[PDB]
RNA sequence: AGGUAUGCAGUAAAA
RNA sequence: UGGUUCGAAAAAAAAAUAAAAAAAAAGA
RNA sequence: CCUUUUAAUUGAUUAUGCUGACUUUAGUCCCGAUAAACUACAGUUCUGCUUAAACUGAGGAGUCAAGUAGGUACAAACCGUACAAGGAUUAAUU
RNA sequence: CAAAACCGGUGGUUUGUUAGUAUUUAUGUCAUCAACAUGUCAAUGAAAUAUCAAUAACGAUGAAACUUAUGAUUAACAUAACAA
RNA sequence: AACAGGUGCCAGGCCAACAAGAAUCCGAUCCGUGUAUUCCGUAC
RNA sequence: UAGAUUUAUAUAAACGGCAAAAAAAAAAAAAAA
RNA sequence: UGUAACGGUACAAGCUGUAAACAAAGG
């Protein structure tokens, strides 16, 4: 190399900026792909069906619809 | 290295003994190895990687 | 994605794009909850 | 045992601690005994002279052998009046109790007294018989620094009306700037 | 009444910062507290508290 | 991530307890683990209200378990983890002393490890060099006087307990001997301020001669 | 993946289908009746009233 | 990450190519 | 340059046993040979095993009872 | 990645980023910036600890073990 | 670093001769944590030299068992 | 269902109706928007009406 | 932690108790509370025809289990 | 030749 | 001592954050 | 068993085949720059390089990285560690 | 020429014994993106509510054990024992 | 023979709250839901 | 359906010009989706 | 709806929301 060896600067300003949850939301990409740490749409199933042993005064199924004062 | 090798003759003399052979008479009549594998490490140089083992056995 | 294209991008969800998938962990054929 | 899926409980059972059974299978088959414990969520039970192959010493240098517990269906009740095993009808009478009825003979198989059996300290779904030294002490027959004692404890203070009012009252005369902090 | 809930619940938690602090200690030597189960008892009898309370409210 | 504090709270949830700390705290100090969310007035309100503590002054940080991966054990699954949870660590200074028995900790197995023992003579880090800021009585305003101990007041004050001659707390085994002055010595031995005595006699200037080609 | 190059992966690979054949109907009549008459011969053939 | 499988697309393409081939002229 | 061809298990074994041979009049033979002259000594006492060793003795043992003819043991005494 | 959330780093905070982030906790407001750089407090936004009078209180964190033989003989009573 | 996610492992894998043993710093702090112990009336050092069960009170040791 | 909305009784909006219970025990649906009470459901034999595609089935 | 003043058992202590005390509870519920409707009206019926039916079928009309899960069989 | 300690608007001049 | 905050100057947005919770009758 | 059928995509010494295991080369190459002593009657080994002051009215003239790189028993563990008022006015107590 | 249902509740069948299984991160990349790591939640055993006694020997339990039970399983390949 | 589950492995009749066999004989070493013979239940 | 239920997921669209910041004085100002 | 961050819980691929596994015996 010429001089002092210059190559992939780590920058987090620049990463989170370019690369983060909200940029990876305003780029262009396959989003029913599976992020661990970001944004994607593989949606999940839910809460599953309650066992017949259990108590149904416990059991919860919803969050947002529900939702009172 | 050879550590392994007199705890396990200074174990069987002191076993023997406890059990009430005479360790006056006792000899190393034959021996077995047994391999157990090999873990393997990265090694790398200039224009390959090599993997580099630690016998066990 | 540099600062002038995210200046004119818009954010996944302000469309309608990502109600029509049915990509989920079971398959492609998520079915709602309530159908 | 295992603890079973909760799909094998049993809803009602037809053995309780000290009914007299005889084992069907096993290296123990023909061997009759009384039942010492029943295990509701293992299916299992305790017999008497079965399974005895654990051993414990105790103070006087002697060794006791405790019974194994085995599979509640690997056993059938037997009937005083014929002496002989038998399975078991339940029958629920018109006032409302559950009532055995042997399969060979049709008689009433009575519940073992109720006053022999005794329940897990946390879990009542383990049962176990009573020897007669445990039940001697029953007819036989402490607080700590931060324990409100009963007298006080036991105390009604809560009247509706005054509760009504004095929410009401915090409520309507409720402020929101701290004027004494600084 | 309310007052006597208002107290119990101050006096509930100090009790559960006094058995934290305790917690923490023996944590920090990687062992169990000695009688763990108080702070389960003090957890129900807060929780029970306001469920005391609420109830009058939705009333 | 804690339910934000009401104005009026009638119920508080948060959760004060003390903190065994591996370096050393002052005689009036002791380390509380707290919520991460509560205010420094928060603090001081919750303590002089629950418990009627005076507190002079609240201290805090915010405390991040470290990340650990799992390396070690037969069949180690190599994930991160965190022990403990976050906390902000409340450093609070009241007007009565705390023992040293509670508030730090101890150990007879590493011998090394006794805070209360070493003090600030040691630093319980990476850290090499101690740094230290100037105290009240170093600094000018609130600060000690150097020559107060020769006023009126303060020896109508002193009585028989207390000697203000400051010649009487020199260290024998520290001091180096008086030098003559008209002869070369070193200034830091015995004077410990910013100035020239005048009994000092005159001493020369020497200005480098940058250019000496020129002359 | 290709074949040869991952497990699960074929160039010729099982496909779902049809195992349905055709045959003539008059064969199958014929073959009722060889059946029948084999069953006559064979003597697994009872008659009931009802 | 696992290679899950389509089966719903699989199989329908398998129906559609298999009706084609066995009705071609 | 590269081997041509793989060493057989024959030649490989062959090589065991004279390497075995080399080493063994190269340095186990005089290894163990000083060993034994050490034992005319009383055993070397490291003094940065204190902490944890035996004290400093002099005496060597007779490893075969069946061959002493003296004495094992004193009397004890009262 | 070697930025980011990943590799157990979790989400950036302050302590991880460069001078100029911003991200607290969680801390209610008590005041207003200035145009300056400075910060005016305002009291009147502390929360205010309702806290009674825990003196000559006979209630305690717990209850004697008597309590539940006692309550249940009393509502048996009354049962029967 | 203690998460074994840099790549100081690969070094390891060749031989090295030896390696610096830092004694002036680690004795400059070492004798550190002496003077600090020092000051107070303990003797961290002599603490640390003690064999299993052995009890030596002040500055003693075999010279004083020589001796006395 | 969730094309569908309940009605607030006194700001005829869409609401959402929760299930209170007194010390009695009595139930109470609530509506978030104004607090109010849910009117008792119309009762079956106002609402009847024969279903005239059955009996055409 | 077990609670000698909790009624019903802990659900993680004693599952089969918890199960069994909430099925021999009065009913709640519409369903099942219509489910015991329904087996009451059959036991009235056989009670009332009681020579003609089995001792086997009075007593299942006779068993009593109430708070029932979906699908509980 | 960024902004310094009652703080928001607001015009001019300038080591 | 810095960040924050005003300016430069920016939706050119650092997911789980804020002077940033329905916004003055605030009960002094 | 035999019989009939099977759409099995049904036979592997070989595609510098794929995924792996295990041999030969071979016990061969590979070992970075300067080191000693810690004592049977006192002490100060030698060498390479030189910002090593840490209140003197002044936060001790920076930024950045270590997603905590000089804490802690001859530990690649556990535990602990960044306080802007620096809390010990601790010239105290004894 | 013979013969002539709708809305709740409860179970069962088929899909499907003949088919397959998919939810958590370790590791790569600036990024788009790529990609079946580590057997199983599980010592062994049907049962540990059969691992007791014990420096050692003989004992105990078990169908099988201080061990072909206190993880199983080819070939290549590793080591030994015996044989003329 | 799909007369489902569980029980030490292949059980219509051992358990599974509503039918019917602890059926008999033979099993290297424990057990048998196994072989052979036979009885019974079934609008399951 | 006894209560409780933090934070993020940039939402006045349970709504109507398009168009940055879920909707921005007229005009400049431009379009196959 | 779905998912996740922190927090609590056996410091967890489970459960769960500062009431963090449980109220069912109130003018």
């Given at each position: 190399?010429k001089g002092n060896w210059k190559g992939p600067q780590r920058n987090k300003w620049k990463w989170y900026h370019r690369h983060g949850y909200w940029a990876t939301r305003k780029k262009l990409i396959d989003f029913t792909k599976y992020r661990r740490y970001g944004y994607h749409?593989?949606?999940?199933?839910?809460?599953?069906?309650?066992?017949?042993?259990?108590?149904?005064?416990?059991?919860?199924?919803?969050?947002?619809?529900?939702?009172?004062? | 290295?050879?550590?392994?090798?007199?705890?396990?003759?200074?174990?069987?003399?002191?076993?023997?003994?406890?059990?009430?052979?005479?360790?006056?008479?006792?000899?190393?009549?034959?021996?077995?190895?047994?391999?157990?594998?090999?873990?393997?490490?990265?090694?790398?140089?200039?224009?390959?990687?090599?993997?580099?083992?630690?016998?066990?056995? | 994605?540099?600062?002038?294209?995210?200046?004119?991008?818009?954010?996944?969800?302000?469309?309608?794009?990502?109600?029509?998938?049915?990509?989920?962990?079971?398959?492609?054929?998520?079915?709602?909850?309530?159908? | 045992?295992?603890?079973?899926?909760?799909?094998?409980?049993?809803?009602?059972?037809?053995?309780?601690?000290?009914?007299?059974?005889?084992?069907?299978?096993?290296?123990?088959?023909?061997?009759?005994?009384?039942?010492?414990?029943?295990?509701?969520?293992?299916?299992?039970?305790?017999?008497?002279?079965?399974?005895?192959?654990?051993?414990?010493?105790?103070?006087?240098?002697?060794?006791?052998?405790?019974?194994?517990?085995?599979?509640?269906?690997?056993?059938?009740?037997?009937?005083?009046?014929?002496?002989?095993?038998?399975?078991?009808?339940?029958?629920?009478?018109?006032?409302?109790?559950?009532?055995?009825?042997?399969?060979?003979?049709?008689?009433?198989?009575?519940?073992?007294?109720?006053?022999?059996?005794?329940?897990?300290?946390?879990?009542?779904?383990?049962?176990?018989?009573?020897?007669?030294?445990?039940?001697?002490?029953?007819?036989?027959?402490?607080?700590?620094?931060?324990?409100?004692?009963?007298?006080?404890?036991?105390?009604?203070?809560?009247?509706?009306?005054?509760?009504?009012?004095?929410?009401?009252?915090?409520?309507?005369?409720?402020?929101?700037?701290?004027?004494?902090?600084? | 009444?309310?007052?006597?809930?208002?107290?119990?619940?101050?006096?509930?938690?100090?009790?559960?910062?006094?058995?934290?602090?305790?917690?923490?200690?023996?944590?920090?030597?990687?062992?169990?507290?000695?009688?763990?189960?108080?702070?389960?008892?003090?957890?129900?009898?807060?929780?029970?508290?306001?469920?005391?309370?609420?109830?009058?409210?939705?009333? | 991530?804690?339910?934000?504090?009401?104005?009026?709270?009638?119920?508080?949830?948060?959760?004060?307890?003390?903190?065994?700390?591996?370096?050393?705290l002052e005689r009036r100090r002791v380390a509380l683990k707290v919520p991460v969310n509560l205010t420094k007035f928060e603090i001081q309100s919750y303590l002089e209200k629950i418990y009627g503590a005076r507190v002079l002054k609240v201290s805090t940080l915010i405390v991040?378990?470290?990340?650990?991966?799992?390396?070690?054990?037969?069949?180690?699954?190599?994930?991160?983890?965190?022990?403990?949870?976050?906390?902000?660590?409340?450093?609070?200074?009241?007007?009565?002393?705390?023992?040293?028995?509670?508030?730090?900790?101890?150990?007879?197995?590493?011998?090394?490890?006794?805070?209360?023992?070493?003090?600030?003579?040691?630093?319980?880090?990476?850290?090499?060099?101690?740094?230290?800021?100037?105290?009240?009585?170093?600094?000018?305003?609130?600060?000690?006087?150097?020559?107060?101990?020769?006023?009126?007041?303060?020896?109508?004050?002193?009585?028989?307990?207390?000697?203000?001659?400051?010649?009487?707390?020199?260290?024998?085994?520290?001091?180096?001997?008086?030098?003559?002055?008209?002869?070369?010595?070193?200034?830091?031995?015995?004077?410990?301020?910013?100035?020239?005595?005048?009994?000092?006699?005159?001493?020369?200037?020497?200005?480098?001669?940058?250019?000496?080609?020129?002359? | 993946?290709?074949?040869?190059?991952?497990?699960?992966?074929?160039?010729?690979?099982?496909?779902?289908?049809?195992?349905?054949?055709?045959?003539?109907?008059?064969?199958?009549?014929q073959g009722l009746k060889i059946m029948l008459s084999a069953k006559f011969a064979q003597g697994q053939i009872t008659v009931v009233d009802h | 990450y696992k290679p899950v499988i389509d089966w719903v697309k699989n199989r329908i393409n398998a129906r559609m190519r298999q009706?084609?081939?066995?009705?071609?002229? | 340059?590269?081997?041509?061809?793989?060493?057989?298990?024959?030649?490989?074994?062959?090589?065991?046993?004279?390497?075995?041979?080399?080493?063994?009049?190269?340095?186990?033979?005089?290894?163990?040979?000083?060993?034994?002259?050490?034992?005319?000594?009383?055993?070397?006492?490291?003094?940065?095993?204190?902490?944890?060793?035996?004290?400093?003795?002099?005496?060597?043992?007779?490893?075969?009872?069946?061959?002493?003819?003296?004495?094992?043991?004193?009397?004890?005494?009262? | 990645?070697?930025?980011?959330?990943?590799?157990?780093?979790?989400?950036?905070?302050?302590?991880?980023?460069?001078?100029?982030?911003?991200?607290?906790?969680?801390?209610?407001?008590?005041?207003?910036?200035?145009?300056?750089?400075?910060?005016?407090?305002?009291?009147?936004?502390?929360?205010?600890?309702?806290?009674?009078?825990?003196?000559?209180?006979?209630?305690?964190?717990?209850?004697?073990?008597?309590?539940?033989?006692?309550?249940?003989?009393?509502?048996?009573?009354?049962?029967? | 670093?203690?998460?074994?996610?840099?790549?100081?492992?690969?070094?390891?894998?060749?031989?090295?001769?030896?390696?610096?043993?830092?004694?002036?710093?680690?004795?400059?702090?070492?004798?550190?944590?002496?003077?600090?112990?020092?000051?107070?009336?303990?003797?961290?050092?002599?603490?640390?030299?003690?064999?299993?069960?052995?009890?030596?009170?002040?500055?003693?040791?075999?010279?004083?068992?020589?001796?006395? | 269902?969730?094309?569908?909305?309940?009605?607030?009784?006194?700001?005829?909006?869409?609401?959402?109706?929760?299930?209170?219970?007194?010390?009695?025990?009595?139930?109470?649906?609530?509506?978030?928007?104004?607090?109010?009470?849910?009117?008792?459901?119309?009762?079956?034999?106002?609402?009847?009406?024969?279903?005239?595609?059955?009996?055409?089935? | 932690?077990?609670?000698?003043?909790?009624?019903?058992?802990?659900?993680?202590?004693?599952?089969?108790?918890?199960?069994?005390?909430?099925?021999?509870?009065?009913?709640?519920?519409?369903?099942?509370?219509?489910?015991?409707?329904?087996?009451?009206?059959?036991?009235?019926?056989?009670?009332?025809?009681?020579?003609?039916?089995?001792?086997?079928?009075?007593?299942?009309?006779?068993?009593?289990?109430?708070?029932?899960?979906?699908?509980?069989?």
């Open positions: 190399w749409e593989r949606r999940g199933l839910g809460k599953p069906r309650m066992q017949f042993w259990e108590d149904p005064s416990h059991h919860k199924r919803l969050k947002k619809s529900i939702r009172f004062w | 290295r050879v550590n392994y090798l007199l705890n396990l003759l200074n174990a069987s003399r002191k076993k023997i003994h406890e059990q009430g052979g005479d360790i006056s008479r006792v000899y190393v009549e034959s021996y077995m190895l047994n391999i157990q594998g090999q873990i393997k490490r990265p090694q790398f140089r200039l224009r390959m990687v090599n993997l580099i083992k630690t016998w066990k056995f | 994605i540099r600062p002038r294209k995210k200046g004119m991008r818009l954010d996944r969800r302000r469309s309608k794009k990502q109600y029509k998938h049915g990509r989920h962990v079971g398959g492609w054929n998520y079915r709602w909850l309530g159908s | 045992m295992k603890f079973v899926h909760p799909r094998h409980w049993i809803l009602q059972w037809k053995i309780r601690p000290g009914d007299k059974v005889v084992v069907i299978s096993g290296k123990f088959k023909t061997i009759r005994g009384t039942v010492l414990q029943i295990d509701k969520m293992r299916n299992g039970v305790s017999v008497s002279g079965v399974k005895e192959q654990k051993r414990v010493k105790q103070e006087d240098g002697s060794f006791i052998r405790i019974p194994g517990l085995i599979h509640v269906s690997n056993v059938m009740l037997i009937d005083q009046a014929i002496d002989l095993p038998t399975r078991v009808a339940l029958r629920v009478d018109d006032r409302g109790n559950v009532v055995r009825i042997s399969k060979k003979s049709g008689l009433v198989i009575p519940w073992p007294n109720g006053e022999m059996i005794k329940f897990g300290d946390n879990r009542k779904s383990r049962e176990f018989l009573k020897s007669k030294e445990e039940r001697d002490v029953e007819l036989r027959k402490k607080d700590t620094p931060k324990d409100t004692p009963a007298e006080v404890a036991v105390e009604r203070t809560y009247d509706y009306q005054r509760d009504v009012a004095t929410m009401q009252a915090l409520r309507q005369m409720m402020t929101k700037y701290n004027r004494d902090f600084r | 009444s309310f007052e006597d809930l208002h107290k119990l619940w101050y006096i509930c938690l100090k009790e559960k910062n006094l058995l934290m602090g305790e917690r923490w200690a023996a944590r920090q030597h990687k062992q169990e507290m000695k009688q763990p189960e108080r702070l389960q008892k003090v957890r129900r009898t807060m929780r029970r508290i306001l469920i005391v309370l609420t109830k009058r409210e939705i009333q | 991530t804690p339910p934000k504090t009401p104005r009026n709270v009638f119920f508080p949830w948060q959760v004060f307890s003390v903190h065994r700390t591996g370096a050393f991040v378990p470290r990340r650990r991966r799992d390396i070690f054990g037969p069949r180690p699954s190599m994930r991160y983890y965190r022990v403990g949870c976050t906390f902000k660590k409340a450093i609070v200074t009241l007007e009565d002393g705390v023992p040293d028995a509670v508030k730090m900790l101890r150990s007879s197995i590493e011998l090394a490890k006794n805070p209360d023992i070493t003090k600030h003579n040691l630093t319980y880090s990476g850290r090499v060099r101690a740094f230290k800021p100037p105290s009240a009585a170093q600094r000018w305003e609130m600060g000690e006087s150097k020559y107060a101990w020769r006023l009126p007041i303060p020896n109508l004050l002193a009585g028989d307990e207390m000697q203000l001659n400051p010649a009487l707390r020199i260290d024998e085994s520290t001091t180096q001997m008086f030098p003559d002055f008209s002869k070369p010595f070193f200034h830091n031995a015995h004077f410990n301020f910013s100035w020239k005595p005048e009994e000092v006699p005159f001493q020369q200037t020497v200005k480098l001669d940058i250019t000496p080609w020129r002359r | 993946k290709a074949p040869g190059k991952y497990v699960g992966v074929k160039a010729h690979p099982l496909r779902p289908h049809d195992q349905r054949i055709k045959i003539n109907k008059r064969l199958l009549w | 009706y084609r081939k066995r009705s071609l002229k | 340059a590269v081997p041509k061809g793989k060493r057989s298990k024959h030649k490989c074994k062959q090589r065991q046993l004279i390497y075995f041979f080399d080493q063994f009049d190269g340095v186990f033979k005089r290894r163990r040979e000083s060993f034994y002259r050490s034992f005319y000594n009383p055993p070397y006492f490291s003094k940065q095993t204190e902490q944890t060793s035996l004290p400093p003795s002099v005496l060597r043992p007779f490893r075969f009872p069946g061959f002493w003819p003296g004495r094992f043991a004193f009397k004890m005494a009262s | 990645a070697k930025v980011g959330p990943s590799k157990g780093r979790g989400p950036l905070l302050a302590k991880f980023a460069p001078v100029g982030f911003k991200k607290g906790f969680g801390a209610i407001g008590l005041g207003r910036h200035t145009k300056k750089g400075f910060f005016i407090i305002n009291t009147m936004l502390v929360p205010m600890f309702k806290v009674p009078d825990l003196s000559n209180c006979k209630l305690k964190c717990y209850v004697a073990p008597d309590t539940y033989r006692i309550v249940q003989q009393s509502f048996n009573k009354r049962e029967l | 670093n203690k998460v074994r996610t840099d790549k100081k492992e690969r070094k390891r894998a060749f031989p090295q001769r030896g390696f610096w043993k830092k004694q002036n710093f680690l004795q400059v702090k070492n004798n550190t944590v002496r003077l600090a112990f020092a000051v107070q009336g303990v003797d961290l050092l002599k603490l640390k030299r003690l064999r299993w069960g052995e009890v030596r009170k002040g500055n003693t040791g075999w010279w004083t068992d020589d001796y006395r | 269902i969730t094309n569908v909305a309940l009605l607030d009784p006194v700001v005829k909006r869409p609401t959402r109706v929760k299930r209170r219970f007194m010390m009695n025990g009595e139930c109470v649906r609530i509506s978030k928007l104004s607090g109010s009470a849910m009117p008792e459901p119309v009762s079956t034999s106002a609402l009847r009406q024969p279903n005239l595609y059955q009996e055409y089935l | 932690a077990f609670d000698r003043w909790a009624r019903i058992p802990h659900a993680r202590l004693d599952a089969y108790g918890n199960f069994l005390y909430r099925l021999n509870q009065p009913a709640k519920g519409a369903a099942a509370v219509a489910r015991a409707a329904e087996r009451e009206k059959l036991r009235v019926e056989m009670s009332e025809n009681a020579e003609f039916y089995s001792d086997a079928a009075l007593s299942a009309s006779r068993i009593t289990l109430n708070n029932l899960p979906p699908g509980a069989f």
